[PDB]
Each structure stands twice: as structure tokens, then as C-alpha cells.
């Protein structure tokens, strides 16, 4: 048993072609896959961008239409500070709603009965929520509260082509005021993509938030969007359904070939392993079995499955049976990234072109072992900064934001702005400012000078082991 | 005397378990400590955030209520430039104060007699301060000044449900005008945390600062906050007092075990040292005694003490006997960081996982010796930039800010903005701008290219000494 | 055949001078070329800057003159949100146009018949474009559209020293409104450069873009500029035409000398190659022939040709036969860069001064081979981020912008701002935000820690091979 | 001749003390010098800051008093766009000037005859400048210009407690309009520093710049400041004159000791050199003579001279014989930096503390040789970017600013903003944008990946040569 088949298996495509009449089908498939998958992603992106733009621009238009005195960029400071201001804002929202068709540049339709759960069939609900009992008397340092939340609702209806004016807010025990209503509009711009326009229903919520009871009432407008096909569409003028099929067939072929290669590898591993058990004791091999498994074909199969799922979802969206543009975009984009990466398989046969992969495979164990110890320090800093500085520092507001701030600091990014945020307000206490000084200096100097230096040293050390000289 | 006990002492928890019936209690304790201390920090953070938000939002509301024409973001340029503007601002502040209940969204109560030290029982004090004698006559390049500061006060009282209008400011010798008053409000939002609301007393100071006599009078509003429990609270609806006890008991157990280990180490060191003095001359060992001391147990004991102190302070705050949220937050956060870090003790038994610690211990002496020489250069630059460029450069205003700017520059951060601040005004003199050019180029090129390179070289050199190959 | 000529050829200028009576003409030429080409670039820059400034300042003035309520910096958010606002903006533009001479600080002349292609001889065209048939009825989730674009035009003429007021916009099917007109003005500031002023014709287009049909209509103003000489110029007061000739002659001399050197090298290579074919088998040498070619002379010849072309174009522009300032500026600037770089030729004879060039020549093959594998990963990330995040992330809007963002991220620049753009809106979906987290963390950690580290290792490895020790 | 004196000379202070009764006077002097010079710098900084703040705040106040509609931050876009706007701005400036005492918060005095050179004894000059002959007729693409500048002046005088209203601007040939006047005020805040207030004369120039003739007229206000002592000052209440003498004496002592050491070194070098010429041929030594010269004493002497000059200038300023605060601040700050640095002399005797200095001395020759080649590339890029992109890119406006931009780019700073400035306007031509892409990508990749990597490699290589292992 000379066993030249083992050597044949771990051969490059050129070597396999020189050996047998083996034309490389997987490689040319992968090139075609890169081209077609990238083109499909871009084609989908046209429609996806149209949808996102429609949503965002309608929301901005609503903010200008319904928020008294609103200007772009003021969103996070937009607030009322007097009873008169609050009343004027609420009444302005309702009044603008009642005359929308006469003023708006967009073609909106009212949605009868879309006033929210506290609506009783009316199209707009004007709700104020307050404590069941509130007896706030700071003058005597006394209060009597029943924290039960009471909802008082006023129903408003559009004229088919007043009551809300008599609103009396219980300011001292007010929790919030909300305005709920729905508007319907058609995304006509989809015609530029030879698609039939969909019906969009925007659910608009305006909140006057007094939950802090701090004398300042933040005002915000949020929208939910529901996309569905029009009941009676008609376009007079009215290819990629076949391009999606082409992508699907290419990815199916790649999947089949890669699965055949994986089964071949499994069989070869099993035959070699039993022959070895015959050559010496039985059960010699524990991990070389895994070495027989090449992860590039696994990656390719995963990418094929993701691409097929994305293509099917895209076909459903075009067919109007689905409106999940974000999920489809994520599937297609991840697939595109993986398809581009997978071609690296054929560069690993040439050591001069495989520096990155070889280095990574030799460095990963030590890197992971080092990161075990770095993780505890990093998480301790994350939690400490999140709780201690979160109230005072804009960049420490949430756990994910604290992580972003610390990760950027490790990379030397946004350092002075991080210090200056504390200089600006000192945390309104010299002790908090001093703590921020210690926290930031220590974290930056540790992670930049020791952790990152040693991490890089491990990477370059691995490279030094694998480089030919 | 075979002395296997010495070897037993410097053994890993797994080795100690294999040797005797020694179950690792300190390690599992540390894991439990990490969990419970982190959870306690987050739980405290809920309340701490509520308090901070109340303070900040009330201050912003005051700025909008009392500062004529105030808009968010203008705080550092907000100023008056004419006598009419100054008078209008002062009168607007007082007028808004007198009608606060009718306009404010928050429920504020006046504080009778809270008008400050220059108040004589009135709730608002309107004070102007000027030189005792001022005869400023620029026309003749003459002046006659008695720098004694005279305070002239006007008392204002709220209506229990005018005089200040006749204010005549001595502009040519005016130092500043201040408005002092106090407002009381209840932080009702604490109910969301199942806590009883506290009474907050805000001390409000508005300053029209003419100390520069420059024709521009900066206007600012500052608040002090005093938190105390309400006299007669009553909430109808109304666990972590036991979680704090759990944390305290866990940290006490860890403290006891670590102290026992430290005493054991001391005894072992003393016995080994006398046996060595018997084996050879007396008083051989000078520093290995210190090697017998393991600093991880010292760190753990310190963390336990800090955690207990923070927990006790938190219990006091909940009990309403204390309102020091910043001190408690700092104690708890530092404790959390130290508790997370301390688990690294058990990674030091495995050289593959101890790269950071081992490198640091070998590199620290050379790093400190190098930093001795770098410190003099750094401090010279700090003082030079603080005095020479502080007047002209926003980022060189104070010593701490100069240090932040230089430290960020060392890390390659905010470079062009630092240059552009000087380009914008040139320091209003070509000589100062040229000096800034030399200062910045020299500091950046020295510290980035030589100091940091050599510092990193020392770190990686230490790592090269300690890495197995 | 001793063949000392080969050794003579690969000799330094000092060695050649010591050998024969060879004075270095190319080196002194290159120094003179650097001086004269740099001076010529700066001299041209005077005029170029004047032209650019005229264009930009006129455009800003038009934006202030014709865009109702326009303020600097609002350009990308400037939009209308109500029918009244749109009508007011359009009418304001036309009204300001009709009274331009009475109000504008610049001296503009109307251009009769410059109203655009849809003008029928009038100086201003006010066009609205809408669908041929539009029956948008969101109320019933129905529409009937003929996507044919209909253009309806109103002609306006200036008074030689109304109809447009009756404009009725078809809002529900409106695509856009445009205002086209032309203005003529003289760039008098060119007199400061002793040049005769040119006639500028600005083509002004104002667009009210409703292509999104989103209830928000962006308003923008764009200008095309046409530069031509005045028919009857007359300046009473009225050197570098000779400086351009000097530059041309210097570059011609350099070109001739370098071409002679290249021909000499070719002849020497051909003689050596045939002598070698005589010494051993025929056709021994395959690539040393190319080694006989020195690329510095090729670079110099290219720079000479570019400098001559730029100088000729500059002479044409001065003569008023050409107005292509950007092309000329690019030719002259590239030439200047190349002329400065080319002097490095004479530093390559001294190994202590040739570190950069020698390192680069040894490192380039491995660097290119490594970049082959890095390119696929980089392009996969580029496409994925462009499509998936382009709609949600300001820095991922276009392919070139995505490339700029990723390239800057590789260099550790603008990291936290990139994360915060996603924090601000979350992509309006938690799934998109999570994907952005994974995308950014993975790309940054891969490219900063592995790719860049290995790239630098390759560079320093090459340097280690070429450094004398 | 055993010559132990040579070895004695190159000995550390501790070794010299152990050898003879040599107490280290220079070292303790240097410590005292650091303390006293730093304190003196800070003390001077108090006064310097007061002066700068007075100047800046008065200028801001003038901008608010005289610039119609001015708001903070608008300075670089502040401009007029219509004839009415221009007239209103000019008249507002003059009107506000005429009622300054009634409105301003500062105490300003008019300066009779301070209206500038074109004033004929009046306190305010209102000048318009225009071409001697201007016949701008864009309608016919004709012009007739006599570029001679004609100045037409209107004199305005303050009421001692109209004509300017009839100003007719020649818009079509207007070059600029200026308003010149002077105001006098006293810097009373200097009293807080126990100093007698000085008289400040502000020269105010307001420019309406039409030099571009672009339909947009930038408006700016600039001030010159002249400081002189008051004629008749009188302060009722009214140490560092002795602290300056203490600094002077300390620096004189250091100077004398260092000069004595330098003379000693010269004599020792001369004696050793002649003894060597006796031991072997004459004129053996060429450069070791220079090795006998220690540059730290030269640095110290330079620092002493600078400190003495700064102290004398500071004494003159306090005495009111001088007002050059910037020159004095620069002298004192540079002196402080040098005094701090000079203490490094005593760390060079201990190799563990001398890593930086030793590395630098071994690396400097190779670093300078490498920088020779890098300089040509850097300068070529600087000039190319300055001319080609200066008109289009905010960060390439001037040579110094281009250098700052490129230097920051080398350090990885402000990269995406540099790209985005070009994305925003594309240079208003796709060709310029493409060139910017090539320019930036090439410069960044070359300088970050090759130049900086090799520079650092040279530094660390030198360190590797000098490190003990
Ligand atoms: C269930 C899957 C059936 C696969 C049938 C393939 C039959 C066939 O012709 O093989 C050559 C190529 C595909 O073959 P392909 O996958 O490209 O090539 C194989 C790989 O090179 C493999 O090595 P690795 O790359 O390292 O895993 C090697 O061991 C195999 O040798 P071996 O076969 O001697 O053991 C090759 O055949 O065929 C086409 O070009 C597609 C024709 C389109 C119709 C495909 C119908 C599915
Ligand atoms: C005053 C303190 C009294 C400590 C009493 C402990 C008695 C006991 O059972 O030991 C085993 C563990 C704690 O024991 P623990 O501290 O976890 O374990 C010790 C450490 O491993 C130590 O090495 P280092 O880690 O390197 O310092 C080793 O030398 C000791 O061996 P040795 O004793 O043979 O000399 C171990 O006993 O006990 C519990 O699991 C807690 C039971 C809860 C009740 C604790 C009451 C305080
Ligand atoms: C014209 C200058 C006259 C200098 C007179 C100094 C006479 C005196 O006492 O020397 C010891 C110290 C100063 O002496 P000082 O400069 O601190 O010390 C000298 C340095 O250590 C020098 O080495 P380097 O540091 O490497 O250059 C060394 O060669 C000299 O040895 P040598 O003399 O045997 O050749 C030392 O005397 O004296 C005071 O402590 C100041 C007393 C205040 C009054 C000073 C009056 C000026
Ligand atoms: C207003 O325009 C005039 C005319 O261009 C400028 O006058 C020049 O001023 C400079 C500096 O004061 C002199 O060196 C020149 O000789 C003057 N004449 C010319 C023809 O340049 C004047 O500088 C401008 N004023 C401002 C404030 O920009
Ligand atoms: Na950086
Ligand atoms: Na940065």
C-alpha cells in the first residue's frame, strides 16, 4: 500500500491538474460566485437604500410638522420649561395634525382608528398619565403619593372634509403626555427601480416626558413603519428574478462540490486512521483526524447557505410577501464578505502568499491565553467606568458605549476629548474628577504601553517562527 | 528536616488539592465575590444615576428659567455687553423668580431666609459689589481707587399668595452682581427604584462678573444641592439590605482567609530564615523575606476593606443617614475593579497565562529608571506651555489641562486641532505663534519618536527575557 | 577586453569626475530645475487661487441672494416642509432675481436667452416636472401612475430698465422644480496680479427636489462657471512669459541629457550581453538587461515632459487661449513633486543615505505578495459596509467614502465617532446596530493588530537584511 | 606623569566627593534654580494672563458693540450681501461709536485725533477706497479701469457732552471701506495682583473688504493695543522685586561655576593634547578636543543668560519702563524648560538612568542621514499640496498649515476629516478630487508604513547597540 492518495489529497489545484485530468471547478466557481454575489448585493442595495431614505425623510418631515419651534440638530436638547410652553407644544402638534392635507408637501392619509390602544376608534389620542394620588408639598417637606399610574385620554378625529383645547395638565403629579396617530403614504420613488410602490403606514408617537419631575420636559417624536403592498396599484410603463436564480444555482453547485470534498476527507481520514491502528497500537490518533478537516470548505458551505437564504428572502421581498430589508441586507452582506474571504483558500498553497494565515494559526493559542488575563482587567474597568462615570460622562452612558470608549482609547483615539468632558463639568465634584483622572491615566498607560505592546510582540513572534528565515 | 512545607506553600491550588484534602475556598470565594460585588455596584448605580440626573436637569431648567435669552450650548460665551442688557438680565431673573409657581413645570417651594449671608431674612438677595472709592477717568489717564470692596444688598421676598426695580449699578467701579436664592423640590422619580423620595434644596447663585472691567460681563448660574429626608413622607405601595449583608459576609470571609494566609507566610518566612541562619552565617537573608509576602493577598484584603466600607456607606445612604453618593460610588467602583483584577492571582501559576504579569515584574525597574529622566523633560514642557501658551491656547488653560494635552499628544491624539488653535489667532503675535510651532514640533517629535519608542523597547525587551524561547 | 567601461557606467558623479573630466551637469541641472519649477508652481498658484476664490465667493453670494432664509452651514439640511414654504422660496428666488441690480454688491449682468434648454429665449426658466398621470390615493391604498415625466415651463425676463406668481404646483405628483438663469461678472481682482480681468458667466441652477416624495423638499443651488476673455478690455497701468521659457529650456536640457544616458545604457547592455553570450552559451541573460535600465532617468524624463506640458498650458491660459486651471495646477504640482523626488538619485550612491530606497527595493516583493491576500478581505469589508451600513451611517454613504473610513480605521483614526454614529440611531433597528458592532470590532482588531503588524514586520525585516550590521 | 587628573575630571559628583573634599555645589544650585525659576515663571504668568485677558475681552466687546448682528463664532463667515446690508452695518458702527459712553459696560474714553492717518484731527475716520476710473460693464463684456486707488474720507467727531449719513458708496469699483478710531481704558483688574493699573489704548479697525468683487463683502474687526502707565495713578491700599534679584544671583552663581568648569576643561584638553603630541607624532588629535567639551555646561550657561535677560525684562515691565509681555514670557518659559532639562547632566553618570541620552547620541547620525532623503519627499509633497489643494482644502491654505496637516497625517491624526473635506466639495471638479485621493493615499501609506517604521527601527537599533545586553 504505497498510499499516494494521501499526498494527492493535500495537493494544490495546479499539482492536481498536473497529476490527473482534474480541471479546477471550485476555484472558477468561487470567482464567478464573488462576481455574482457582489452584483446581487449592490442591486439589492438600490431598493434597500430607497426604503431607508423614505423612512428617515418622513420622520424628519414629521418632526418639522408637529414639533413647535423644532430645528435640525436640537433633538437631544429639545424641551419645554414652562407650563405655557408645554401647552403650546401640545396644541401645536394637534392643530398641525388637523390641517395636514392643506399644508404638508407629502400626500398623507389619516388612519381612522389608528390612535393607539387608548383610542376608542378615534384617529388621534392625546393622553396624559399621572399618579393616582399626588400631594407634593415641598414647602412643608411633605408628600403623599399613590404611585398608581392613571391614564386620561382625549380622542381627536380629523375633519372628513375643541375638546382637546380644554386639556388641563396635572403638572405636580404628571408623568408624561403622549400623542399617538398614524399616517399612510406611498413610496413612489421605487418606480426609479422599476418596482411597484408599497403602502407605508407610519405610527407616530410624540412624548412630553416628565418622568424626572425636574422642571424640564424633554420632547421627542418616534415613528414605527409598517410596509405592505397596495390593494389597487397601477403603473403604466412596467430580469433580476433570474439573476437571483443564477446566484442560487451557482451557490448550490459550490455547496455540492464542497460537501463532496468534505465527505472525501472524512473517508480518507477514516481509512488512514485504521491503517495506522494496524501499523501500531490501536487508537493512536486523537487530533490529526481534525487536521483532515479543512475549514475553508466549511466556511464556503456556510457562505453558500447564507447566500441562498438571503437570495430567497430577497425574492420574497420583491414578490411582496416579505418586508424585512434589514435581515436580508445583513444576510447578503455577510455572505458577500465570506465569499470574498473564502478565495484565500487557494493562496494557502504558496507560503509567500500565506503570511497572514500561517502567522494567525501559529499565534492564536498564545493570543487567546494572553487575552484570558487581559479580559478580567478590561471588564473591571468597563464596569467601574460605567457606574462611576456614566452619570457624568457622555461617553460612559451605557455598557456598550463604555466598551466603545475604552476600545478606542486602547487604540489612541479620542483621548483629549475624553479628558475634556470631565474638565468641562469636573463631574460637579472634585472627587469624581480626580477619580476620572486616575481611571483614565491608568487605563490608557496600561493598555497602550503594556497590553498592546505585548499583544503585538506575540503576533510578530509567531511570524518570526513561521517566516522562512 | 526535609522541609517539604516550603514547596507546599508555593504550590498551585490544583497541586495543593492533589497533595492534601485542600479544597480551594479562596478561588470560589473570589468568583462569588466578583459576581456579587458587580451586581451590587450596578444596583447602587440605579439610585446614583437618578440623583445625578435630578441635579443636572434641575440646573438646566434654572438656566432656562432665570437667564434672559439663554440657549443650550452658549454657557461659556453667555454675556452682556450694554448697560441696558445687564439691567434687563438682572430684572428678568428677579421677575421670573417672583412668578415661579405660575410658570415652572417643576414643583418648587421658596425657602424663606435662604437668600444668603447678605440676606437679612429675605428669600432672595440682589447684591452689587464695587470699590469703596472709584474715580476712573481714562480721558485724562488718571484714576483714584480705594480697592476696598463694598457690598450693597437689596432684599426681595416672594408673594405669600418694586424695590429691586430701582437698582442703580455703579458701572465704572462695579466688581460683580449676584442673585442668591434657594428652591426646594422632591425627587419623585426615586419611586421607580422602590425608594422613598428625598427633599432637595437647591442653592442658586447667578453671577454677573465684571472683575475684568473689559466691557463684557459674563453671566453664569451655579447650584449647590443639599439632600435630606422628608419630614412627612407617605407612599402607598412601598431586599437589597440583605444583599448588602451577603456582600459584607462574603468579603469578611475572604478577608479572614487572606489574613490567615498572610500570617502563615510570615511564620514560614521566619522559620526558614532562622534555619538558614543556622545553615550558614547569621543574618544572611535581606530581601527574600519580602519575597515570602505575596501581594495578591494584600490586594485582596484592601479590596475587601474597601468593599465593606462602600457597602456600609450604601446602607447608610439607603437608611437616609447619609447622602454622599459620589464617595460611595467611588468606593464601590474601585472595589469592583480590584475584585476583578485580583482573580489574576490564580493565572500566575501557569506561565502561558502569566505573560503580562511576568513581563511587568521584569520590566518595571528599567521602566521606572527611564521615567526618572523623562519626567524632568515632561515637567519642563508642562510648565513652559502652561505659562507661555495658557493665555492664548484653549488646551493650555490649566496645569491639569496642559498635562492632558501633552499626554494625548504623546499618544498621537488631537494634533492638528492643537496646531490650528494657534493658527486661528496666532496668539495675536507672530512671536508667540512661532514659539508654539517650535514647542509643539519639538515635543511631539521627541516624545513620539524617541521616548515612546524606547519605552516600548524596554517592555518588549523584558518580554524577550521572560518568554520561554 | 578589460572592460573598465562597465565599472565606469555604474559610478557616482564624484567617482566619474575623479576618473575623467566629467563635470556633473545633470545634478546641477536638477537643482536649478527644483528651484525654477517650484517658483513657477507658486507663481501660477497666485492666479489659480484668485480664480477659485472668485468662483466660491460668487456661489456663496448667490446662495444668500436667492435662497429664502439661507444661513451658512445649513446647506445639507436646507429644505421646505409645507406648501406655503415651498411657494415662498420659489417666489423669493424669482423676485430677488428681478431686482438684482438694485440690491447686489456685485456688478452682475443678465444674460438674455440664458434661461436653459426649456427657456424659449427668456433669461430665467421656472420649470416644474411631474408624472404624466398621477392618482396617488393613500386613503384607499390605491394609485394609478404613468411615470412619464412632464415638464411645464414658465419664462421670466428681467426688466430692461406676474406670470410666475400664478404658479400652481402639482404637489402629489411633483418630481422637482428648477430655476435656471445666467449671470455675468468681471473678476477685477486679477489686476493685483498684473493680469487683464476675464469675463465669468455663472450658470445658476436652483433645485427643489421632491424625488423622494417624503414630505421634505431639499433645496440646493449649484453653479457652473465659464471663463472667457472680455471683448473690449482696457486697463491703464498694464516677465513670467520669459520665466516659463526658462523653465521649458531647463527641462528640455534635462530631458536631452537623460535620454542620452538611457541610450548609452541600452548600448552598454547590448554590448555586454553579446560579450557574455560569447563567453558562455548564447542567450544567458534574461533580466540583468533590465537592471541596466535605471528608472531614475525614466522618472526624470516623465517629469520633464509633464513640466513642459504644464508650462505650455500655463502660457496658453495667460495668453487667454485656455481656461483649464485645474488641469494646469495638477500638471505643475505633480511635476514639482517628481522634480523634488528625482534628486534622490544622487543619494543612492551612499548606503548611509539610501536606507529608504534600499529597504523599499528589498521589501516590495513580499509586501505585494502579502497585500494580495489582504486585498480580498479589505474589498469584502468595503462592499459589505457600503451596502449594509451605507443607508444608516454617514461615513458609509459611497464606495470611496467607505474606503476612506476603513483606511482611516486601519490607522486608528476616528474610531469612537464611527461607533457613535451607530449609537445615535442604532440604525433604527437593533439588528443593524449589532451587525455594525460586529463589523467594526472585527475589522479594527484584525487590521490594526494582525495586518498592520505583519506589514510593518515585513518592512523592518527587509531593513534588517539590508542594514550593514 | 601618572595623570590621575584626567580620570578625576570625568568623574561623577559622588566619586569626586569620595576623592577630595568636593561638595557638589552645581547640583544643589541646579535644584534651587529649578525651584526659583519655576516659581518666577508662574508669578509672571499671573500678570501676563491678566494682560492677555484684558486685550481679548475688550476685542470681543468691541465686536459685539460695533458689528451689526454679530454673534460669537460667526467671525469667518460674517459678511454683507446687499447694498442695504452694507450701509446698515457701516451706519450701525458709527452710531454705536457716537453713543458709546451711554451704552458700554466698560469705561472708555475717546481719543481726539486718533482717527488714523487719513483723519485730519477727527477721532473717527470713515474711508472708502475705489479705483480712480471704473467702467465695469459686464453686459457688453467691456471694462475700462485705471487701477489707481482713490481714498475718500469722512471725518466724525464724538459729542463733547449727520455728515457720515450721506455716504454714497461706489459699489461697482469699491475696493474696501474702513472705520478707524481709538479707545482708552484702564486695566483695573491688575489690582488683584497688587500692581498699579496701566492705561490701554485700543486702535480699532473695521474693514468691509470688497477686494474680491464677488458680491460678498467680509466684515472684520481688528485691534492693536498700546500699553503705557497712567499719568496720575492713585491706589489707597498699595516683594517679588527681591525674588527676581534672588533668581538673578542664583543664575549668576551657576553661570560662574559652569564657566570655570569650561575653562578647566579647555586647559585640561590643551595639556593632554600636547602630552599626546609628545608621546607620538605631533597633531594627532582632531576631534577628542571637542569630546573634552561637555555641552551640558554650555546649555546651563545659555539657560542662565536667558533667565537673567528674562528677569531683567520682567523687572523693567514691573517698573513700567517696558510692556513686552510676550517676549518676557517666551524668555522665562524657555529658560524654565532648559533649567528643568539641564538636571539630566547628573543622570548621565549612571547607565541605567541614561538610556534616552545614550540612545540619542548613538542614533542621531543615522537619523539625520535618513532625514536628508525624507526631507526632499516631504517638501515636494508640501509644495504640491499647498498649491494644488490650497484653494479647495481648508487644511492646505498656507505653507505652515500644509506642514501641520502633513505632520499630523504622518502621526495618524485627523485622517478621515482630511478626506471628508474633499468629499464635501470634490474640489468642485472630479479631477481635483481624484488628485486629492492619490495625493493623500500615497503620502499616508508611504510616510506611516515606510518612513516612520524605518525611523523607529533606526532608534531601536541604536538602543540595541547601547543596551548592556
Ligand atoms: C454530488 C456532487 C457531484 C459532483 C460531480 C463532480 C464530477 C466532476 O466532474 O468532477 C470535476 C468537477 C468538480 O470537481 P472539483 O470539486 O472541482 O475537484 C475536486 C477537488 O480538486 C478535490 O480536492 P480539493 O479541492 O482539495 O477538495 C480533489 O480531491 C478531487 O479529486 P477526485 O474526484 O479524483 O477524488 C477533485 O475532483 O466537475 C465540474 O466541473 C462540475 C460539473 C457540473 C455538474 C456537477 C453536478 C453536481
Ligand atoms: C480565622 C480564619 C479561620 C479560617 C478557617 C479555615 C479552615 C478550613 O476549613 O480551611 C479550608 C477552607 C479555607 O482554606 P483556604 O484559605 O481556602 O486554603 C488554604 C490555601 O490554599 C493556602 O495556600 P495559599 O492559597 O497559597 O495562601 C494553603 O497553604 C492552606 O493550607 P494549610 O491550611 O494546610 O496550611 C490552605 O488551607 O475553609 C473553608 O472552606 C471556609 C469555611 C467557612 C468557615 C470559615 C471560618 C472563618
Ligand atoms: C569665578 C568663579 C569662582 C568659583 C569659586 C568656587 C570655589 C569653591 O569653593 O569651589 C567649590 C564650590 C564650587 O565648585 P563646583 O563647580 O561645584 O565643583 C567643581 C566640579 O565638581 C568640577 O567638575 P565638573 O562638575 O564635572 O565640571 C571639578 O573638576 C572641580 O574640582 P577642582 O576645583 O578641584 O578642579 C569642582 O570644584 O564652591 C561653592 O560652593 C560656591 C561658593 C559660593 C561663592 C562662589 C564665588 C564665585
Ligand atoms: C483697502 O484697500 C487699499 C487699496 O487696495 C489697501 O491699501 C494698501 O494698504 C497696504 C497696507 O496698508 C499698503 O502697503 C498698500 O500700499 C496700500 N495700497 C495698495 C494699492 O495696496 C488697504 O490695505 C485696504 N485696507 C484693508 C483694511 O484691507
Ligand atoms: Na494613533
Ligand atoms: Na484622532
PDB file of N, CA, C and O in Angstrom, chain D residues 61 70-72 82 111 141 155-156 188 191 195 237 239 248 252 261 352 363 370 372 375 448 455:
ATOM      1  N   UNK D  61     -15.781  92.516  23.162  1.00  0.00           N
ATOM      2  CA  UNK D  61     -16.785  93.525  23.463  1.00  0.00           C
ATOM      3  C   UNK D  61     -16.951  94.495  22.301  1.00  0.00           C
ATOM      4  O   UNK D  61     -18.070  94.887  21.972  1.00  0.00           O
ATOM      5  N   UNK D  70     -23.763  90.839  14.978  1.00  0.00           N
ATOM      6  CA  UNK D  70     -22.674  89.912  15.241  1.00  0.00           C
ATOM      7  C   UNK D  70     -23.060  88.915  16.330  1.00  0.00           C
ATOM      8  O   UNK D  70     -23.719  89.264  17.310  1.00  0.00           O
ATOM      9  N   UNK D  71     -22.647  87.657  16.148  1.00  0.00           N
ATOM     10  CA  UNK D  71     -22.775  86.625  17.165  1.00  0.00           C
ATOM     11  C   UNK D  71     -21.470  85.847  17.251  1.00  0.00           C
ATOM     12  O   UNK D  71     -20.742  85.723  16.266  1.00  0.00           O
ATOM     13  N   UNK D  72     -21.170  85.344  18.445  1.00  0.00           N
ATOM     14  CA  UNK D  72     -19.916  84.632  18.659  1.00  0.00           C
ATOM     15  C   UNK D  72     -19.825  83.404  17.762  1.00  0.00           C
ATOM     16  O   UNK D  72     -20.785  82.647  17.626  1.00  0.00           O
ATOM     17  N   UNK D  82     -25.908  92.614   0.435  1.00  0.00           N
ATOM     18  CA  UNK D  82     -26.684  93.601  -0.296  1.00  0.00           C
ATOM     19  C   UNK D  82     -26.186  94.995   0.052  1.00  0.00           C
ATOM     20  O   UNK D  82     -25.535  95.209   1.078  1.00  0.00           O
ATOM     21  N   UNK D 111     -10.426 109.205  21.878  1.00  0.00           N
ATOM     22  CA  UNK D 111      -9.079 109.724  21.681  1.00  0.00           C
ATOM     23  C   UNK D 111      -9.164 110.731  20.546  1.00  0.00           C
ATOM     24  O   UNK D 111      -9.252 110.346  19.379  1.00  0.00           O
ATOM     25  N   UNK D 141     -19.498  92.847 -21.943  1.00  0.00           N
ATOM     26  CA  UNK D 141     -18.194  92.206 -21.792  1.00  0.00           C
ATOM     27  C   UNK D 141     -17.069  93.218 -21.988  1.00  0.00           C
ATOM     28  O   UNK D 141     -16.051  92.935 -22.623  1.00  0.00           O
ATOM     29  N   UNK D 155     -14.762 112.555   8.116  1.00  0.00           N
ATOM     30  CA  UNK D 155     -14.327 112.737   9.493  1.00  0.00           C
ATOM     31  C   UNK D 155     -15.538 112.817  10.406  1.00  0.00           C
ATOM     32  O   UNK D 155     -16.495 113.540  10.114  1.00  0.00           O
ATOM     33  N   UNK D 156     -15.502 112.066  11.500  1.00  0.00           N
ATOM     34  CA  UNK D 156     -16.556 112.067  12.505  1.00  0.00           C
ATOM     35  C   UNK D 156     -15.931 112.387  13.853  1.00  0.00           C
ATOM     36  O   UNK D 156     -14.851 111.886  14.179  1.00  0.00           O
ATOM     37  N   UNK D 188      -8.163  97.759  35.443  1.00  0.00           N
ATOM     38  CA  UNK D 188      -8.280  97.807  36.899  1.00  0.00           C
ATOM     39  C   UNK D 188      -8.015  96.453  37.540  1.00  0.00           C
ATOM     40  O   UNK D 188      -7.607  96.397  38.706  1.00  0.00           O
ATOM     41  N   UNK D 191      -5.145  95.263  39.993  1.00  0.00           N
ATOM     42  CA  UNK D 191      -5.106  95.480  41.435  1.00  0.00           C
ATOM     43  C   UNK D 191      -5.082  94.169  42.209  1.00  0.00           C
ATOM     44  O   UNK D 191      -4.489  94.099  43.289  1.00  0.00           O
ATOM     45  N   UNK D 195      -0.660  95.327  41.673  1.00  0.00           N
ATOM     46  CA  UNK D 195       0.033  96.162  40.708  1.00  0.00           C
ATOM     47  C   UNK D 195      -0.791  97.385  40.417  1.00  0.00           C
ATOM     48  O   UNK D 195      -2.009  97.368  40.575  1.00  0.00           O
ATOM     49  N   UNK D 237      -4.604 101.298  48.990  1.00  0.00           N
ATOM     50  CA  UNK D 237      -4.004 100.204  49.750  1.00  0.00           C
ATOM     51  C   UNK D 237      -2.498 100.073  49.502  1.00  0.00           C
ATOM     52  O   UNK D 237      -1.699 100.313  50.409  1.00  0.00           O
ATOM     53  N   UNK D 239       7.937  92.801  46.874  1.00  0.00           N
ATOM     54  CA  UNK D 239       8.396  91.535  47.408  1.00  0.00           C
ATOM     55  C   UNK D 239       9.060  90.790  46.265  1.00  0.00           C
ATOM     56  O   UNK D 239      10.153  90.249  46.429  1.00  0.00           O
ATOM     57  N   UNK D 248      18.326  86.161  39.909  1.00  0.00           N
ATOM     58  CA  UNK D 248      19.476  86.671  39.172  1.00  0.00           C
ATOM     59  C   UNK D 248      20.775  86.221  39.829  1.00  0.00           C
ATOM     60  O   UNK D 248      21.717  85.809  39.147  1.00  0.00           O
ATOM     61  N   UNK D 252      23.545  83.816  38.222  1.00  0.00           N
ATOM     62  CA  UNK D 252      24.913  84.305  38.096  1.00  0.00           C
ATOM     63  C   UNK D 252      25.904  83.322  38.703  1.00  0.00           C
ATOM     64  O   UNK D 252      26.958  83.053  38.119  1.00  0.00           O
ATOM     65  N   UNK D 261      34.217  75.641  35.049  1.00  0.00           N
ATOM     66  CA  UNK D 261      34.363  74.262  34.603  1.00  0.00           C
ATOM     67  C   UNK D 261      34.757  74.189  33.132  1.00  0.00           C
ATOM     68  O   UNK D 261      35.567  73.343  32.740  1.00  0.00           O
ATOM     69  N   UNK D 352      22.030  53.022  33.702  1.00  0.00           N
ATOM     70  CA  UNK D 352      20.639  52.600  33.803  1.00  0.00           C
ATOM     71  C   UNK D 352      19.679  53.776  33.682  1.00  0.00           C
ATOM     72  O   UNK D 352      18.551  53.603  33.212  1.00  0.00           O
ATOM     73  N   UNK D 363      22.164  57.255  17.913  1.00  0.00           N
ATOM     74  CA  UNK D 363      21.232  57.253  16.772  1.00  0.00           C
ATOM     75  C   UNK D 363      21.221  58.488  15.925  1.00  0.00           C
ATOM     76  O   UNK D 363      20.833  58.415  14.766  1.00  0.00           O
ATOM     77  N   UNK D 370      19.202  59.664   7.270  1.00  0.00           N
ATOM     78  CA  UNK D 370      17.916  59.214   6.745  1.00  0.00           C
ATOM     79  C   UNK D 370      16.978  60.392   6.473  1.00  0.00           C
ATOM     80  O   UNK D 370      16.297  60.441   5.435  1.00  0.00           O
ATOM     81  N   UNK D 372      17.776  63.309   5.637  1.00  0.00           N
ATOM     82  CA  UNK D 372      18.185  64.002   4.418  1.00  0.00           C
ATOM     83  C   UNK D 372      17.334  63.568   3.230  1.00  0.00           C
ATOM     84  O   UNK D 372      16.815  64.401   2.479  1.00  0.00           O
ATOM     85  N   UNK D 375      13.489  64.457   3.631  1.00  0.00           N
ATOM     86  CA  UNK D 375      13.136  65.869   3.526  1.00  0.00           C
ATOM     87  C   UNK D 375      12.706  66.254   2.117  1.00  0.00           C
ATOM     88  O   UNK D 375      11.772  67.043   1.947  1.00  0.00           O
ATOM     89  N   UNK D 448       3.566  56.673   6.831  1.00  0.00           N
ATOM     90  CA  UNK D 448       3.240  55.867   8.001  1.00  0.00           C
ATOM     91  C   UNK D 448       3.942  54.515   7.935  1.00  0.00           C
ATOM     92  O   UNK D 448       4.569  54.080   8.908  1.00  0.00           O
ATOM     93  N   UNK D 455      12.397  54.938  10.587  1.00  0.00           N
ATOM     94  CA  UNK D 455      12.900  55.868  11.591  1.00  0.00           C
ATOM     95  C   UNK D 455      12.925  55.220  12.973  1.00  0.00           C
ATOM     96  O   UNK D 455      13.935  55.275  13.696  1.00  0.00           O
TER      97      UNK D 455
END
